[PDB]
Amino acid sequence: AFPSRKDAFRAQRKGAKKHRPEIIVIDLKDHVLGRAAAVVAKQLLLGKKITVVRCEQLNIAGTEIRNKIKYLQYLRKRKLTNPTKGPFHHRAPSDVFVRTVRSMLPRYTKRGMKALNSLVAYEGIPPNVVRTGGRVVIPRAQRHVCYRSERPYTVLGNMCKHVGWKYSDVVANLEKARVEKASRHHEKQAKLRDAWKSARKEALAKMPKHNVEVLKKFGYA
Amino acid sequence: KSHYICAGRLVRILRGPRQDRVGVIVDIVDANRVLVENPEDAKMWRHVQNLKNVEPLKYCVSVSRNCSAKALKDALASSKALEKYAKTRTAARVEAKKACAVSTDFERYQLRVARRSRAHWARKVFDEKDAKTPVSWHKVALKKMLKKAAKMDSTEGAKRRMQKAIAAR
Amino acid sequence: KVSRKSPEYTTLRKSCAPGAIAIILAGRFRGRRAVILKQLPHNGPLVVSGPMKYNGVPIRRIDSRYVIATSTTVDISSVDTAPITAEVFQRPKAEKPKKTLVSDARAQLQKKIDAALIAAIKKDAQGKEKAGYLRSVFTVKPGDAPHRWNW
Amino acid sequence: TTSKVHSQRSKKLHQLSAKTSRVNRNRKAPRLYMKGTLAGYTRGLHGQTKQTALVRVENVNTREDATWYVGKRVCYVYHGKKVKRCVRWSKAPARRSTTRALWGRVTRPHGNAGMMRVKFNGASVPASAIGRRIRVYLYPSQI
RNA sequence: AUCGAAUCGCCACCUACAAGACUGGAGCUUGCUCCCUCGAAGGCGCCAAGUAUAUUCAUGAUCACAAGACA
Ligand SMILES: [Mg+2]
Ligand SMILES: [Mg+2]
Ligand SMILES: [Mg+2]
Ligand SMILES: [Zn+2]
């Protein structure tokens, strides 16, 4: 992952500025696992670079016990003669989502592999993703519009924690620290947000009046 | 709180051929259907609407179930529900959406310059206020650096370097 | 009724009428707004001279398929448009082997046409706004739905 | 040698004091095409038919929307390894590049969700273009 | 330094959080009434640093990868 000295030297020779590819960051909290994965897989095949965060807060319909049992049935499948080379049962929730997307992809083609490698999965929100830009959601894969609220539902992090995932507490503490840092920084800059809001308000009295009338016509003033 | 589906409740049609029109519940068939009518709208005669396609508004006129057209019209005119609804922001947003939808290239240009003109004057007003009360990143950085800079520059050696390298310029 | 072999025969759509303001969709001046002056005879290409002072577009012919003729028009009945003939854009054959070079006659035609076009724009009630309209540059933004727009 | 922090301090103080709330303005060359992506070819479970391409265009999500683009020019841009002949090779030497284009036109909408069918001039679009950018221009214009 | 390339929206206002059986706020009458910023916009950007007194654009000759691209 570390760039080669040749690549750093070429970048210095060209004098190019810092570059970031067009990447969509999806917050997977309260998102249905299969519906989000199907949507993500289609977008990956269409050529989008997608990074998903908070994978541990994905949701699966039904009780946690039956979802844990379903994974345990998946875990029991292994090549008897040689468990190495057998199915690799990843426990991390981000790895669970990646496997679900992978099964929805044609993983045995170069095109399918390119789509799969265009996806990055995280538990929680890592610092390199926090400040990159506004996160997105999938409206047709959201719990509050997909599940009937009476039905019990499973949280992916809780399901994974009891089937082998060992970093549930680490992710929870990191998420707690991140929200506290974000809340403090959002408590700050409120004066900046309020000042800009008042600046826009005062602009109406200083700008040409026919321009105001156009704004009122199109519902902006 | 949410607005109930009751006889006399005013609703807006969410989707379909009557999208963004207003009517009155007038009657309830079952858990899924109602009988909407609005005398003042041309296309809003008494018809059946599914409850999934209606947005209950905050106004309820005083009518009975399966009321006559005259009784509905009198109640609507007396209650002033449509006039009150016209003054809200949601109604203005709905009307502005139609204006954008039927806008021409010239109208799109006029909105663009109007919004940019407001954007320019917002920047002017913000700059005037930010000069006095530092709230932006650069003004805040300057205000923190100023006190240490003045102390660091008020030395004899600082004066000599400033004068020598400025007179050289 | 009009003979199909006559220079006066045309099939051009109504939106590309003389005096209308067109958006250029291709070529060196893509995205620029311009004013339609005329159509060359024999169902030929349009001639646009959206004033070079406003946007840099000179008197150039353009196929009507490479232009969006907006519903916003300008009354250019005071513009002569007669000297703009098919012969203006013809070129002599080149034999077998930095300010832009413009022939004097082309320069005079541009001068007179643009001056009259500017005057007609001034005469319009919304002329100052339409002059800014001609200066504006059209572009396809992220999120744009040109197929859904009126023009 | 004197430390550079002093001159940097003076320059940083001047720039911070002279900073205004200026914004970034997109005054570059305009984009005159809608951006799309090649989803693949026409196919059934039996296999694909490479003579017809399927292009998904941003903001085109209805069959009525895709109808508006019928007959429009479609261009796939890529690059080779060597600089070969292009249009206006002699007239405009600045156009010479490894960049290449393959052209086509929209024939009909595909499905109900804004997908359109595209036929390329003579040959079919390469399979390496699947998932890559396609440019849908606004000409020929019916407006 | 080969190297000509495909990509074509920027931000130090989105880039914090949570709830959709309901988070603008009250009252009691508990589904109605009243108050408000009136509950259906993240800000900019799209060619004069701003809506005016303006201003060089061509012959790159009618489409051609935008012949350029640090916003
Ligand atoms: Mg719900
Ligand atoms: Mg409430
Ligand atoms: Mg190029
Ligand atoms: Zn009621």
UniProtKB/TrEMBL annotation, chain A:
Superkingdom per UniProt: Eukaryota
Pfam hit, one: Ribosomal_L13
GO molecular function: mRNA binding; structural constituent of ribosome
CDD domains: Ribosomal_L13
GO cellular component entries: cytoplasm; cytosolic large ribosomal subunit; nucleolus; ribosome
GO biological process, one term: negative regulation of translation
Gene3D superfamilies assigned: 6.10.250.3250, Ribosomal protein L13
Keywords assigned by UniProt, alphabetized: Ribonucleoprotein, Ribosomal protein
Entry similarity comment: Belongs to the universal ribosomal protein uL13 family.
UniProt name for this protein: Putative 60S ribosomal protein L13a
Species lineage: Eukaryota, Discoba, Euglenozoa, Kinetoplastea, Metakinetoplastina
TrEMBL record, chain B:
Coiled-coil parts of chain: none
Domain of life: Eukaryota
Keywords annotated in UniProt: Ribonucleoprotein, Ribosomal protein
Single GO molecular function: RNA binding
Domain KOW, residue spans: 8-37
Biased composition (Basic residues): 160-169
InterPro entries: KOW, Rib_uL2_dom2, Ribosomal_eL14, Ribosomal_eL14_dom, Ribosomal_eL14_KOW, Translation_prot_SH3-like_sf
Record GO biological process: ribosomal large subunit biogenesis; translation
CDD domains: KOW_RPL14
Domain Large ribosomal subunit protein eL14: 45-118
One Pfam family it belongs to: KOW
Keyword ATP-binding in record: no
Region described as Disordered: 150-169
Residues spanning the signal sequence: none
One Gene Ontology cellular component annotation held by this UniProt entry: cytosolic large ribosomal subunit
Bias kind Basic and acidic residues: ranges: 150-159
Similarity comment: Belongs to the eukaryotic ribosomal protein eL14 family.
Protein name: Putative 40S ribosomal protein L14
Organism: Leishmania major
TrEMBL record, chain C:
Record's keyword annotation contains Ribonucleoprotein: yes
Name used for this protein in its record: Putative 60S ribosomal protein L6
SUPFAM superfamilies tied to this protein: Translation proteins SH3-like domain
Binding-site residues for Mg(2+), renumbered to this chain: R61
A GO molecular-function descriptor: RNA binding
Keywords: Metal-binding, Ribonucleoprotein, Ribosomal protein
GO biological process: cytoplasmic translation
Superkingdom as given in the UniProt entry: Eukaryota
Protein family membership: Belongs to the eukaryotic ribosomal protein eL6 family.
GO cellular component, one term: cytosolic large ribosomal subunit
Family matches, as Pfam families: Ribosomal_L6e
UniProt key word Metal-binding: yes
InterPro entries registered for this protein in UniProt: 60S_ribosomal_eL6 (IPR000915), Rib_uL2_dom2 (IPR014722), Ribosomal_eL6_KOW (IPR041997), Translation_prot_SH3-like_sf (IPR008991)
TrEMBL record, chain D:
InterPro entries for the chain: Ribosomal_eL33, Ribosomal_eL33_sf, Transl_B-barrel_sf
Gene3D superfamilies: translation elongation factor selb, chain A, domain 4
Record-level GO cellular component terms: cytosolic large ribosomal subunit
Family stated for the protein in its record: Belongs to the eukaryotic ribosomal protein eL33 family.
The name this protein goes by in its record: Putative ribosomal protein l35a
Example of a GO MF term: structural constituent of ribosome
Start and end residues of each stretch annotated as Disordered: 1-26
Pfam families: Ribosomal_L35Ae (PF01247)
Keyword Lyase: no
GO terms for biological process, alphabetical: cytoplasmic translation; ribosomal large subunit biogenesis
Record keywords, A-Z: Ribonucleoprotein, Ribosomal protein
